[PDB]
Amino acid sequence: ALTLPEDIRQQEPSALLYTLVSAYLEHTAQTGDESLSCLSDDQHTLTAFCYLDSQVEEGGFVQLIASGYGEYIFRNPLADSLRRWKIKAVPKVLDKAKALYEQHGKTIETLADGGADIPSLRKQFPEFEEWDGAYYEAAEQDLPLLAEHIQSNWETFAHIGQA
Amino acid sequence: HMTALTLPEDIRQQEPSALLYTLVSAYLEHTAQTGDESLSCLSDDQHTLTAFCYLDSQVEEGGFVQLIASGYGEYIFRNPLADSLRRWKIKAVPKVLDKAKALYEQHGKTIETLADGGADIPSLRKQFPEFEEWDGAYYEAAEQDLPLLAEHIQSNWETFAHIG
């Protein structure tokens, strides 16, 4: 289960909707059995990436971690799944940020559960700021490459469900 | 009663950000409408937001013909999406949906059938140009209503922030 922080409310409209759709979808991808969710492995990887991107491009890794799905980003092989698609900069950032998530993750999740807000968590864990910056740089470069991959494997991404 | 979505090849042409938004909105629309008909995973209001994102991401880029060709136009037009948005004080998009609904009733099935048979979006738009007037009216409506929708979400944060 998830509870998105209040700070997301301030986002520009299109960012806010990308954030919400990506979080709702990632939640179904984790929870949902085959009946609830029809996503293939690759569509799952894309889903996790949009969750990551929508969360970090705006609230940083602290915000991502506070939402509580850090394990699905850092312990599942998202970084390696993306590398398999010839995407390298985002995965490297994930590998680097993982050390801070292992160090501070449990504490951040626990405090967010206890009611801590994002501005306060970001004040206590500023170590993630440098990786939030690195992530923005890596995504600027890798978003076009992700799009090329989707464009080159269209059938994998174009179809959902069964008729 | 569609239970599968098939995104038209034309979407490959979108810029990266719009492409990702199109794909996650479509995956979620399918997940919500077909996998969560019980409303146990996402609440009715999150289902309404999901349908609006699917509407928006499809029409802003390719128009109502693209939305109808992708699939699920029946849920966008026959389910009370316009009325659900009206309860959120959003009026311009609903007015457009009401107009586009008439056209869906008349041409929707033919468009879905043609798309299933292999028709592309450019040819389907040439044959069903009647939707163009509403694609444009939708764009103008969304310029005003996207900010109002965000305003409603901001004012009812709990309804939207809680996923469980």
Side-chain angles (χ1 to χ4, degrees), chain A residues 34-35 38 159-163, chain B residues 1-6 30 34 72:
Chain A
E34 330 315 298
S35 196
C38 277
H159 301 267
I160 6 305
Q162 290 178 274
Chain B
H1 268 297
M2 300 195 159
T3 47
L5 284 181
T6 290
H30 180 265
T34 303
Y72 285 42

Side-chain angles (χ1 to χ4, degrees), chain B residues 84-152:
Chain B
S84 299
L85 297 173
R86 282 189 178 100
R87 283 184 169 275
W88 292 354
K89 316 302 84 158
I90 286 160
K91 296 295 173 291
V93 166
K95 279 164 78 319
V96 176
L97 288 175
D98 294 335
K99 296 300 189 115
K101 174 178 177 83
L103 290 180
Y104 178 71
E105 284 310 327
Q106 161 169 47
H107 308 301
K109 183 163 295 167
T110 298
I111 291 165
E112 292 171 354
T113 297
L114 293 176
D116 187 68
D120 61 30
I121 301 307
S123 295
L124 285 178
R125 287 169 56 75
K126 186 192 181 84
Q127 185 161 347
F128 300 93
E130 320 85 291
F131 286 100
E132 286 177 33
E133 178 187 6
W134 306 110
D135 293 338
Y138 178 80
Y139 175 85
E140 297 184 292
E143 284 181 319
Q144 173 185 257
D145 287 358
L146 230 68
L148 292 181
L149 172 59
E151 190 180 312
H152 172 83

Side-chain angles (χ1 to χ4, degrees), chain A residues 23-163:
Chain A
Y24 290 175
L25 184 66
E26 176 57 18
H27 171 65
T28 69
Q30 288 306 309
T31 198
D33 187 272
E34 330 315 298
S35 196
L36 171 50
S37 185
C38 277
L39 302 184
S40 68
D41 279 359
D42 281 341
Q43 289 170 337
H44 187 85
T45 296
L46 178 64
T47 296
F49 174 76
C50 294
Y51 185 58
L52 168 73
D53 189 63
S54 63
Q55 289 283 316
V56 180
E57 297 275 4
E58 308 280 321
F61 279 108
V62 172
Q63 182 190 286
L64 171 75
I65 295 168
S67 289
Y69 279 170
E71 58 305 319
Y72 301 132
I73 295 308
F74 293 112
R75 304 271 172 82
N76 275 349
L78 173 60
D80 278 336
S81 293
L82 293 172
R83 283 185 183 105
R84 274 193 178 297
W85 297 346
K86 305 189 303 177
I87 300 181
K88 309 305 187 41
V90 165
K92 173 73 37 173
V93 176
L94 289 178
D95 287 346
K96 288 284 172 177
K98 178 177 199 297
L100 291 173
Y101 159 78
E102 295 296 354
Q103 180 173 2
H104 304 292
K106 185 66 180 172
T107 300
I108 286 158
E109 299 172 338
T110 296
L111 293 173
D113 286 339
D117 72 15
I118 290 304
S120 282
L121 288 170
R122 286 179 54 79
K123 186 182 179 54
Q124 183 165 343
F125 301 98
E127 317 79 79
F128 291 95
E129 286 166 23
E130 97 165 280
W131 300 107
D132 290 345
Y135 177 80
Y136 305 144
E137 296 167 335
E140 162 169 309
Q141 171 187 85
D142 291 355
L143 229 69
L145 297 177
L146 178 53
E148 297 191 328
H149 176 80
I150 288 165
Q151 291 162 352
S152 297
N153 288 269
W154 187 235
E155 290 304 300
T156 292
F157 297 96
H159 301 267
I160 6 305
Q162 290 178 274

Side-chain angles (χ1 to χ4, degrees), chain A residues 2 9 24 151 157-158 162, chain B residues 3 7 12 27 154 160 163:
Chain A
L2 311 176
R9 288 156 76 248
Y24 290 175
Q151 291 162 352
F157 297 96
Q162 290 178 274
Chain B
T3 47
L7 306 183
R12 292 164 80 263
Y27 294 169
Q154 285 170 60
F160 297 99
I163 330 180

Side-chain angles (χ1 to χ4, degrees), chain B residues 3 10 13 17 21 25 33 39 47 52 57 75 78 83 87 92 100 105 125-126 128 145 153 161:
Chain B
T3 47
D10 142 42
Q13 266 72 235
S17 289
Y21 174 59
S25 299
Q33 186 60 232
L39 302 185
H47 272 246
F52 169 83
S57 66
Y75 306 116
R78 301 201 195 186
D83 286 310
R87 283 184 169 275
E105 284 310 327
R125 287 169 56 75
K126 186 192 181 84
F128 300 93
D145 287 358
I153 289 162

